[PDB]
RNA sequence: AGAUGGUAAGGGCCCACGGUGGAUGCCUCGGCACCCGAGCCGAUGAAGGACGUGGCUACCUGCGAUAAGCCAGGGGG
């Protein structure tokens, strides 16, 4: 992902509630599966998207853990 | 009547050139010694492991379902 898009992702994430972060992670893990399915049938030439979503999910869960940690 | 040479199936010695083999010399990522520095880790689960982890990934390295990585500060360019 572009550095600017990563910065923005964290800014918006840090404004979300724990509940919204959970819902969002759930949806991104759903999209990851969809990406897996495509990569499995050789229909995902943009394979960089898989790593990207995975790190997004990690960033999201990192912030979720941030919110809950205090 | 007599006398003495050319035979090389193959062999021997020498010479040339190869093959095999990996000595020798050069080399060094590694090692050895001494000296100095530094010196504990663990139930907040250690030491050490198993299994995982990559779009394609056998192994090694890293990492742990957030899985060759997540956040932030510092360095750097
Ligand atoms: Mg990043
Ligand atoms: Mg004769
Ligand atoms: Mg002869
Ligand atoms: Mg002959
Ligand atoms: Mg002889
Ligand atoms: Mg020879
Ligand atoms: Mg020889
Ligand atoms: Mg050789
Ligand atoms: Mg020498
Ligand atoms: Mg020590
Ligand atoms: Mg261990
Ligand atoms: Mg491994
Ligand atoms: Mg960082
Ligand atoms: Mg940094
Ligand atoms: Mg920096």
């Amino acid at each position: 992902m572009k550095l600017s898009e990563v910065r923005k992702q964290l800014e918006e994430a840090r404004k979300l509630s724990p509940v919204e972060l959970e819902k969002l992670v759930r949806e991104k893990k759903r999209e990851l599966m969809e990406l897996r399915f495509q990569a499995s049938i050789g229909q995902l030439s943009q394979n960089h998207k898989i790593r990207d979503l995975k790190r997004q999910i990690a960033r999201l869960l990192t912030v979720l853990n941030e919110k809950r940690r205090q």
Side-chain angles (χ1 to χ4, degrees), chain A residues 1-22 24-70:
Chain A
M1 220 161 67
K2 290 165 193 286
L3 245 189
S4 58
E5 293 155 359
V6 165
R7 245 179 261 124
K8 176 109 188 187
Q9 178 172 47
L10 292 164
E11 291 169 17
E12 304 306 300
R14 269 150 183 165
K15 297 174 195 173
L16 285 179
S17 81
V19 163
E20 295 171 290
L21 286 161
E22 278 183 355
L24 185 59
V25 161
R26 198 170 286 124
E27 311 199 358
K28 270 172 184 304
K29 275 187 184 267
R30 175 176 170 87
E31 190 192 330
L32 214 208
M33 177 189 67
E34 272 173 38
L35 284 185
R36 281 198 304 275
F37 274 53
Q38 281 187 278
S40 98
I41 64 197
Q43 289 188 8
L44 183 86
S45 51
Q46 299 196 304
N47 56 44
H48 80 267
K49 282 164 79 155
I50 276 165
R51 176 171 310 165
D52 258 42
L53 236 189
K54 280 166 89 285
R55 280 151 205 225
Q56 289 182 42
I57 294 159
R59 257 178 310 256
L60 289 183
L61 291 174
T62 301
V63 165
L64 206 168
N65 182 272
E66 271 174 16
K67 303 289 203 124
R68 298 203 197 273
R69 217 144 70 241
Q70 310 127 324

